[PDB]
C-alpha cells in the first residue's frame, strides 16, 4: 500500500537483490502498520466491550 | 480511544475542579462554605457534562 514514490524507487534500483531488498523492506512496512491498525482495533473493540460488560455487572447487581 | 486525546485535546472538563479551587485558594474563607464546595464539586464530578442538573451546577459553583 506504499505510495507511487517506494514503486518508483522499486524500478530505480537496477540490481535485482536491491529491489528484491527494497520490496520485502516495503513488505514488513506495510506488515507492521497493519498491525498497528489490528492492535489498536482489538484494543478499543475489547476497551468497548469491557465498557458494556461494566452496565452487564451492573444489571447482574441489580 | 485509540488516539486518547492524542488527536482531541484534553477536555478540561475535570479540570473545572482544580481551575475553580485556585480560583478559590487564594481567599481567607470560613468553613461551611468549604463543604458546601465539596459536595457541589463532587456533584460535578458524578454529574455528567451534558446534563441541565450539570449545568445549573456549574452555573452555581460559578
Known amino acids: 500500500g506504499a505510495e507511487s514514490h517506494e514503486l518508483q524507487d522499486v524500478l530505480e534500483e537496477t540490481n535485482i537483490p536491491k529491489r528484491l531488498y527494497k520490496a520485502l523492506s516495503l513488505l514488513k512496512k506495510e506488515f507492521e502498520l497493519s498491525k498497528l491498525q489490528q492492535r489498536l482495533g482489538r484494543e478499543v473493540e475489547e476497551k468497548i466491550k469491557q465498557t458494556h460488560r461494566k452496565f452487564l455487572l451492573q444489571e447482574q447487581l441489580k | ?62
Open chain 2, 1 to 62: 480511544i485509540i488516539k486518547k486525546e492524542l488527536g482531541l485535546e484534553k477536555d478540561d472538563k475535570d479540570a473545572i475542579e482544580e481551575k475553580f479551587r485556585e480560583r478559590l485558594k487564594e481567599l481567607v474563607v470560613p468553613k461551611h462554605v468549604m463543604d458546601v464546595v465539596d459536595e457541589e464539586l463532587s456533584k460535578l464530578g458524578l454529574l455528567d457534562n451534558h446534563s441541565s442538573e450539570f449545568n445549573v451546577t456549574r452555573n452555581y459553583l460559578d
